[PDB]
Amino acid sequence: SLAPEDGSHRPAAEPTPPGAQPTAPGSLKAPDTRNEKLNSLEDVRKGSENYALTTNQGVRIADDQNSLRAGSRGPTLLEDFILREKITHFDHERIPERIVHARGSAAHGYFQPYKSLSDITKADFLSDPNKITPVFVRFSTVQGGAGSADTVRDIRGFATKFYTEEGIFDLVGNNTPIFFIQDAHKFPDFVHAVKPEPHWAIPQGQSAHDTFWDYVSLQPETLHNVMWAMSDRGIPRSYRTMEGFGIHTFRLINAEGKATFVRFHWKPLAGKASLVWDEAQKLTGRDPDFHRRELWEAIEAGDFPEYE
Amino acid sequence: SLAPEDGSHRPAAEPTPPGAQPTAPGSLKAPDTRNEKLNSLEDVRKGSENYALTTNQGVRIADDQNSLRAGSRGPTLLEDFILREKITHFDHERIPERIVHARGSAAHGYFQPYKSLSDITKADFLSDPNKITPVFVRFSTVQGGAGSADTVRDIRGFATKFYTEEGIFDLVGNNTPIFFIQDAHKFPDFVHAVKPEPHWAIPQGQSAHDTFWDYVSLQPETLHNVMWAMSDRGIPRSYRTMEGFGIHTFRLINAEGKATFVRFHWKPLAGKASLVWDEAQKLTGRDPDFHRRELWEAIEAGDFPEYELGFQLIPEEDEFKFDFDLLDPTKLIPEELVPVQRVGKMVLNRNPDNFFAENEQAAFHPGHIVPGLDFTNDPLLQGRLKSYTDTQISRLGGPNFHEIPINRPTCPYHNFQRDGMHRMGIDTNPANYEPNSINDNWPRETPPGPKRGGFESYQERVEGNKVRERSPSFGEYYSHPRLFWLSQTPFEQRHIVDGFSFELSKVVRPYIRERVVDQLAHIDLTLAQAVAKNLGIELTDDQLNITPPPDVNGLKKDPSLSLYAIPDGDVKGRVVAILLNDEVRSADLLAILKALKAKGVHAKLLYSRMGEVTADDGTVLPIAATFAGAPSLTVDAVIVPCGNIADIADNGDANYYLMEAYKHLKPIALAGDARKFKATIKIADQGEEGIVEADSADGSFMDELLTLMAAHRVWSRIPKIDKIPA
Amino acid sequence: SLAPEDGSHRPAAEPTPPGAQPTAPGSLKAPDTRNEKLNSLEDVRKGSENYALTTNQGVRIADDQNSLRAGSRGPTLLEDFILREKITHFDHERIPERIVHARGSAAHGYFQPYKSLSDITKADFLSDPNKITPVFVRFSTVQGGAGSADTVRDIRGFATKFYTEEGIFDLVGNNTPIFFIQDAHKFPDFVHAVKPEPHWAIPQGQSAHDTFWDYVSLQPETLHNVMWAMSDRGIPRSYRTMEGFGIHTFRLINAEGKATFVRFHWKPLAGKASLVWDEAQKLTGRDPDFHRRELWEAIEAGDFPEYELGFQLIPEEDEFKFDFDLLDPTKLIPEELVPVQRVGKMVLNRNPDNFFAENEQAAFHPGHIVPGLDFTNDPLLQGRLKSYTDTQISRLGGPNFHEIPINRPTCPYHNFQRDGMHRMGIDTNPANYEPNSINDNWPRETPPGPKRGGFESYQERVEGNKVRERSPSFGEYYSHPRLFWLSQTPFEQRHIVDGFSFELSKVVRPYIRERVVDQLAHIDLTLAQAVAKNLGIELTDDQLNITPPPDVNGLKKDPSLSLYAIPDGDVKGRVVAILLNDEVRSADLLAILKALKAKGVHAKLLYSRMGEVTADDGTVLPIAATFAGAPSLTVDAVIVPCGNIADIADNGDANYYLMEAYKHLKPIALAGDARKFKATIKIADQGEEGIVEADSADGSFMDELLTLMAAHRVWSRIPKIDKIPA
Amino acid sequence: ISRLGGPNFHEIPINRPTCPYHNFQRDGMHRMGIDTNPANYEPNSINDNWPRETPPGPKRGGFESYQERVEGNKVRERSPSFG
Ligand code: HEM
Ligand code: HEM
Numbered sequence A: 001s002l003a004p005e006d007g008s009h010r011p012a013a014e015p016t017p018p019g020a021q022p023t024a025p026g027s028l029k030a031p032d033t034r035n036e037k038l039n040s041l042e043d044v045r046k047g048s049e050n051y052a053l054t055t056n057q058g059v060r061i062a063d064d065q066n067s068l069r070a071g072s073r074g075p076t077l078l079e080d081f082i083l084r085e086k087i088t089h090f091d092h093e094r095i096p097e098r099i100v101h102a103r104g105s106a107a108h109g110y111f112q113p114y115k116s117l118s119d120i121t122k123a124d125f126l127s128d129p130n131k132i133t134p135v136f137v138r139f140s141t142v143q144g145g146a147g148s149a150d151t152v153r154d155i156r157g158f159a160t161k162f163y164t165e166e167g168i169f170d171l172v173g174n175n176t177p178i179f180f181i182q183d184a185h186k187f188p189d190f191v192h193a194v195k196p197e198p199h200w201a202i203p204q205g206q207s208a209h210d211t212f213w214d215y216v217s218l219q220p221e222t223l224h225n226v227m228w229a230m231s232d233r234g235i236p237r238s239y240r241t242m243e244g245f246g247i248h249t250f251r252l253i254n255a256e257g258k259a260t261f262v263r264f265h266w267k268p269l270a271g272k273a274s275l276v277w278d279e280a281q282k283l284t285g286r287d288p289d290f291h292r293r294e295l296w297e298a299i300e301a302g303d304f305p306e307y308e
Numbered sequence B, C: 001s002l003a004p005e006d007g008s009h010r011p012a013a014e015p016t017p018p019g020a021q022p023t024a025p026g027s028l029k030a031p032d033t034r035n036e037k038l039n040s041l042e043d044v045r046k047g048s049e050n051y052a053l054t055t056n057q058g059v060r061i062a063d064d065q066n067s068l069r070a071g072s073r074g075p076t077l078l079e080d081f082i083l084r085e086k087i088t089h090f091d092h093e094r095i096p097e098r099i100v101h102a103r104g105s106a107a108h109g110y111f112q113p114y115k116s117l118s119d120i121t122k123a124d125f126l127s128d129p130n131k132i133t134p135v136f137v138r139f140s141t142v143q144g145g146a147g148s149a150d151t152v153r154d155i156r157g158f159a160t161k162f163y164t165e166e167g168i169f170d171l172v173g174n175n176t177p178i179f180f181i182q183d184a185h186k187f188p189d190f191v192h193a194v195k196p197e198p199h200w201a202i203p204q205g206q207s208a209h210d211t212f213w214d215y216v217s218l219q220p221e222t223l224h225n226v227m228w229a230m231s232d233r234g235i236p237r238s239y240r241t242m243e244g245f246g247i248h249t250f251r252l253i254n255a256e257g258k259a260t261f262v263r264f265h266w267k268p269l270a271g272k273a274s275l276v277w278d279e280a281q282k283l284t285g286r287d288p289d290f291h292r293r294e295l296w297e298a299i300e301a302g303d304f305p306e307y308e309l310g311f312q313l314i315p316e317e318d319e320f321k322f323d324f325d326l327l328d329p330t331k332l333i334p335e336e337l338v339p340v341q342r343v344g345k346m347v348l349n350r351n352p353d354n355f356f357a358e359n360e361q362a363a364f365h366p367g368h369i370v371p372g373l374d375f376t377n378d379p380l381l382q383g384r385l386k387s388y389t390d391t392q393i394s395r396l397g398g399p400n401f402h403e404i405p406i407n408r409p410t411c412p413y414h415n416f417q418r419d420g421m422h423r424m425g426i427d428t429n430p431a432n433y434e435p436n437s438i439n440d441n442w443p444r445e446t447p448p449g450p451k452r453g454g455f456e457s458y459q460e461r462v463e464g465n466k467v468r469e470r471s472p473s474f475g476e477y478y479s480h481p482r483l484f485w486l487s488q489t490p491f492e493q494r495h496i497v498d499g500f501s502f503e504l505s506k507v508v509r510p511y512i513r514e515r516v517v518d519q520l521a522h523i524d525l526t527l528a529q530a531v532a533k534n535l536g537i538e539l540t541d542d543q544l545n546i547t548p549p550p551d552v553n554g555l556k557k558d559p560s561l562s563l564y565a566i567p568d569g570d571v572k573g574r575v576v577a578i579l580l581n582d583e584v585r586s587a588d589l590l591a592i593l594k595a596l597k598a599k600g601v602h603a604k605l606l607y608s609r610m611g612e613v614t615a616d617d618g619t620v621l622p623i624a625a626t627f628a629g630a631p632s633l634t635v636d637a638v639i640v641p642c643g644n645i646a647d648i649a650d651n652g653d654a655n656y657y658l659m660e661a662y663k664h665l666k667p668i669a670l671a672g673d674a675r676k677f678k679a680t681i682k683i684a685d686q687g688e689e690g691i692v693e694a695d696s697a698d699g700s701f702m703d704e705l706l707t708l709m710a711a712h713r714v715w716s717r718i719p720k721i722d723k724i725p726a
Numbered sequence D: 001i002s003r004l005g006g007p008n009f010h011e012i013p014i015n016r017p018t019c020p021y022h023n024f025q026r027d028g029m030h031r032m033g034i035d036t037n038p039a040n041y042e043p044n045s046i047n048d049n050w051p052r053e054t055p056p057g058p059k060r061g062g063f064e065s066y067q068e069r070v071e072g073n074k075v076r077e078r079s080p081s082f083g
């Protein structure tokens, strides 16, 4: 039940254009792409070739096709511990999805500053143009579930974890430079209003329904981010072709103790580009994994997403 | 006071057609629709009107718009317990979704048998035609997450919780009569292979990817249900228009101890109807909630989903009388050999109040049987029995999931089990063990008997060694696929070939496509050649000479396997788009709308904008949706009344509406100058079957249109659509 | 039927003294003790008598003794869904214990004010003496697990949940009026220091180990509560005989918006009483459930625990009038400076039905306040507010813990929070957000006001920079420990020295012992020297010369800090051991039992075996327990009546009973020839205060014994116990 | 599953095997192991079917149960021999 003789089951471990080979796990596609975070995960990476099939307790399995039964047409027996572990693990695979931004696509990479920022901040990851910081970035929609579609009309998240020498810094931003509401106390109200309505749990991935527009009509502070959502910003061509923003004013603190107010931005070096509505909506049906796929294939092709 | 003065925020508490009023919680929409289960939920239903807003501890909130801060521009303070509760509860709203069938839509209803089945089963819910059993039914897809789309190509789940006077019975079935695999030990393999691939978590709601077809190519036992999924069975028009099956052979046990083998069926009283692939795919985009919405709105309209429960019954002494093993879940029992005997009717007549509380938390499990029913050694059923209680420990947070309101029996339940997370019941029994003397041994065991007796397993003889071995009787894989194929109409067979062709075209590794084509050549050469041609694959001389599998007990077809070979059309509950213009012929619209109403067919009035238009006689017509807003995908037929057609003749959306409905084989009727649209869809002057046209919508115009709607789609149009650019 | 013919399996549903009947769930023992909370639980109470045993799905079980197997010696079969459900529920019975206060014992009761406090608070529960508020109170230790022992040396928790008409108010206090630390940031440090050490998880229920004393020696703020723990406060006789304190300064807010600072007090109406250390430690071995049992049996007997709620009230303008900071929870407010105003009484009159469902799952949280109360900036209180809701997410499984029956408010609760694990309430509101129009904005905010108003924080002025810095006003550590020390009687002081001496002897690293003695020398030289002498440590020159800390606002003692300085003894509910012989003088028993009954003091009749003995007039005397089976540790006094003393005079166990009681300073009474036992306790011919002796047990002998009992223990005996080997 | 929080309790360090363990099980709360296998199912061709079943044998073989003879009816019944 094996591989074709020609080795065509296995993608080449070199950059290849979208469609040219089957996609594959990053460490097998690009084994020589490394950074300090990717290497540190080696303790938990598990291979598979040449290894025997076992239970989680390390017992080799001889027949992974059949339950233990009393005769070959008889009842399954309680002492089949190999069936039991396998089905138990399956039965507990799912964990709760994120309350918001449940739909999202992620990749590893690295950051470096162009020059030291020590005059305005003592943050170590911005102190030296030749000190590189690994990152992990997840891009997301907001409203829909983890199995909802990519090219919906929605705000997009753009979350970067920087693994710095002085701690993890997470820059948890969106693709518009404002949010819909002013005070966190209203967040469950706003989110409840945009999410599927509670009697029937419709609509998925859409603010196009009564509760969302009800809230907006009654809370004019939402109008600014609503304008953004209704423009073609709401339907990016790719996570590579949208802007990012931390939205809030934060502070930078330098070694002298001086505070400077700061708002964060990501500029996409592939430029800004969006779909048009009819195309975005139809694409949720023809390929609901369009942005996930496009990101993954850009990285396999060497079109690495870059942001300033 | 934020509601509009005119009370138009609030839907009428009476049955109303789809889109007429906002949808609402079932107990608000239909407060007078009751059954024993819905009434037992009253203890936990919570209203809202006229009540003060409070924390969960009952403290009234004064300002639900602001956090507590030091200064109106200052920092938020830790002492804000009201903000803290409200955000904590939001932060923990989600629970794990179901491992499979995570996407599903549910409703309350009731079941009653047509006659007492006491001669064959002592099951209390089937003992008396006047005994009504409340039900809760959830329909679902299989692969996709809870946020995935409805009209994917996939198998559908059909699960019924019968709240009986002798315990909960859950009939947890699907919409095809077999499963993909034989032994539960392979379920994680099969499901892993169909679900999104583990490196990148693509694709959602689709079997059209390498790992699924790699597994199918290596496990020919799957081919039978793969045939059903590749047919139009995989894309139903509505949960009201698909069949349901328990798949496994179970047992009925009567009061005298006699066991009869049984397979369970549900027959849709609305008939069998499916979409076509392009329409279903495109509909996952334009309305990924289409089935959920359709079910809720049918119920709000009074088009209650009805199903007839049927049994295929096989005497114990006939176990070995077929060419296939009755315990093999990849084999169906053809109705030509063993007819379905009608047993009773289920009506689904009220929506839930809160989807999460009642739908998302419902827990069904096929091990929940009641005296009068029993299992067999089907090795797929046998393994299911270990899964459905276990999974509920994480999904629903512990062993007291039966105390979540929707899951509660309506009959008594008492035992010595105690504690666990979220324990609601406060037990007063002095004893938590038996045997006990300190409570005189209560609650007590009950012997089996003809009614109200304790459960005892049928004493089936077991004989064999402890083995991990598939029965040799299960090792046949192609005859049932072939029977299914031969039973389909020519247009159904085309759709099957196109399903395989589309799916295998998304398989990136070509050797897998070839291997699947080789399996198809073991089933039927015509099917294999037609899929191969679509894939640019040439069968070898060896493939062309594979001998066809034998007939199934002498049958070379069984028409009950087809959706369409035997007409069972029912137009009630269907919907028609009506494409308006700014000066509609009011007489056409009168004739159209009243004819639809008389047959319970709904209408949606469409235009190029919202608001109103005024008919020729001054009648003000409210617009339900724009042509783009409610695409032809969402209706069963399209009518264009006469009027000022030049208004919409150059509207690309209007023209495309007709081309889309035409490609997808829907009836189209054109009155008066609306016949100018004939050139958009290339209709000959003299007309064509499946297009209704006349000088006005009067006389036989609506009857002819309704006749087409009864037949569902215009299959004869298939050759003409290949050419059209839509 | 397994119950005995005579019905002696079932306890009478009437008040009965400790040991007279088997104990029972509260709604069976006292079915007509009612309050609004107990009544509202009726919807989840489950009975048992006369019901069939079923699965949780309602299926009747026939054979609850056997698994389903293939043959009666064969393998168990996966299809046994009855065995699976029963074992699955058992497998998941346990939930995490509380992080602290895991060991605790709880009862239902009610509270009523003595007068309307509307001049000082708009809290609805305090507004009217006829307003009765149901409570559920849980007492606890702090350090040990849910299965650790009750009579350890520890602080005790005293948590009351008030089910008011305007919200749940939880008063989550302890039995000492301060805490060990100042800022909540240190809580995990202090708790990790006192809890079992991390390498080997020893010792359970004890602070007597290196890490606790290391932390104390390095954090002098702890020393005040450390003084209380080492005093006999740390070892209460009963939860009925200790004080309760909220510890923090809170605020009362009246209808005019005026804030008054308040600290809360509970005064035990049975008086203050504690064990002695040897007795407490031995009782953790003989009955680790002693306090839980005492509370349960006191309520079953009608000896309801009663407490008076007290407030210390300080006007806002007086915030800085003391030489300690009102916000510093390591500081007490001496009653000599601010008297406790008696505000109402709380009576605990019914045990739970199911310990797990009602005690283990109860969730209390000091942030649960109601309109009319508010917080202060006490930095320990502030951080508590973040802990008690968060911890309930893992302990009780999610954010719907307020829907677990015991935690539910009895007043209305309505808001827009939805979902979460084990969601019971099914919301029918069309809206789950506000502002909404589609339900006319209901449930709606309510402005604050004199009654039934929404919650608004008191608008305290905040001025300062964002800093992690301890207020300099908190930086004084020795004056309150000294005030406490000087307020104790000389025997209380000796017990303190002995607590420190015993604990520090168990610290393996001697430098920690020396550092703690250094701290003591900053409090009081006499205390420091006495502990040092017991540890073989010599104070330095410098230590001998440490200036004692200042008085507290001119106070050099406050007798309200002593357990015993001011008599407040109550004998009702106490217990006397009566040591029988095989021919007891019936006239003694009549007199003894009569006099005890008059004062509500219980008795237990003890002998050297179970069954009965017969008194001189043929009265049959049932035996409650043996001398070894119910040790003197478990009683408040011992009486030996006359009769055939030779039956018992060389019973080692009888003599021991009397030596142990004597060592533990318990009143002993000896009648007639019972005076032969004077030799085993070395009592002089002419008597000794604390030993009652006469020719027979007349009413004079009993009045004397009962007067010793009112004074709890015989402190004058201390210098004499040194010599007895017990 | 409730005591240790999910189905990956064998990845808690004290419970981990010291010998190799490789199979097609995935996910579950607190998942530590990061699987690189292209396949999470078998039979598969895309990873040449690895990791693979192993026949039983004298050493290093896969587990097979002893083929004990089973004969009787499906009963809930204590063996009289235990009485
Ligand atoms: C400026 C406005 C906000 C932005 C830019 C933002 C951004 C995001 C992003 C990008 C994620 C997904 C992170 C990931 O990929 O896992 C996320 C998750 C989340 N956010 Fe926010 N958010 C905002 C406001 C809020 C507010 C006001 C709250 C609640 C007070 C909130 C609560 C959450 C929660 C509960 C998650 C799920 C986090 C998790 O499960 O790990 N967000 N947010
Ligand atoms: C005849 C073959 C099968 C049929 C007809 C079937 C049908 C269904 C249906 C309809 C549901 C959804 C119930 C709902 O709406 O909540 C479901 C859920 C489920 N099934 Fe099956 N199933 C089959 C085979 C299996 C097998 C072999 C296993 C594993 C041994 C399995 C394990 C599960 C689990 C884990 C769930 C989630 C159940 C829950 O979370 O409540 N199923 N199945």
Ligand code: HEM
Binding pocket: C097, C098, C099, C100, C101, C104, C138, C139, C140, C156, C157, C158, C159, C172, C173, C174, C178, C179, C183, C184, C187, C246, C247, C248, C329, C362, C363, C364, C380, C383, C384, C387, C388, C391, C392, C395
């Ligand atoms: C004056 C100081 C404090 C007092 C009087 C006090 C009192 C109590 C009491 C009586 C309980 C047991 C309630 C029950 O019976 O279920 C308890 C539990 C608890 N406390 Fe405190 N406590 C104090 C300080 C703190 C601090 C500073 C923290 C954390 C910052 C904390 C966190 C907790 C937690 C986690 C529990 C377990 C709560 C639960 O599981 O429901 N406590 N406390």
